[PDB]
């Protein structure tokens, strides 16, 4: 069953897709988004269609060293974590602060104690790649803030 906030999230994301065709998306794609969210929750124990499921369905229909997906996964997490303290006004985050937080977010996905250092090093390398792309701005702690881009 669709959650109440999921309806607002769904209409917003449907407008987002409809804006991009100024094939062409019709209301059948909205019904398809509902149907894919239903299917994803159908592969899970919870009937509550959270906005995360609708986001996954949106990604799967809209999309029509380190590996690409593993790297890009960390980018959203880090950007959202920094935007969180942006809204809160709390102290800004260093590289170590981001790495420790990210490792805590994926405690259950790690395979072994040896993989701990591997993922920490990969996270530092990903941070360096992001700085090289200027999505994170370094200011002086070695302070990382959202880049003006």
């Amino acid at each position: 069953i669709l959650t109440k906030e999921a309806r607002s999230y769904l209409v917003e994301k449907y407008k987002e897709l409809r804006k991009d065709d100024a094939y062409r998306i019709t209301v059948r794609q909205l019904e398809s988004m509902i149907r894919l969210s239903e299917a994803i929750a159908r592969a899970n124990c919870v009937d509550e269609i959270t906005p995360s499921f609708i986001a996954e369905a949106y990604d799967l229909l809209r999309q029509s060293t380190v590996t690409y997906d593993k790297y890009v996964s960390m980018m959203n997490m880090i950007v959202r974590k920094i935007a969180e303290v942006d809204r809160e006004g709390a102290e800004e985050l260093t590289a170590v602060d981001i790495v420790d937080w990210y490792l805590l977010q994926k405690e259950n996905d790690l395979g072994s104690l040896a993989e701990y250092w591997e993922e920490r090093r990969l996270a530092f390398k990903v941070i360096k790649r992001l700085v090289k792309d200027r999505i994170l701005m370094e200011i002086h702690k070695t302070v990382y803030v959202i880049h003006p881009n």
Binding site: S52, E84, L104, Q105, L110, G111, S112, L113, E115
Partner: peptide
């Protein structure tokens, strides 16, 4: 969601991964 906001564990995360490993078999 963002439930894992402040699990401020010590270096015991390595022991947590030991728990993950040594009992998986």
């Amino acid at each position: 969601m963002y439930k894992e906001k402040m699990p401020d564990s010590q270096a015991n995360l390595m022991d947590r991964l030991r728990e993950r490993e040594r009992r998986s078999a």
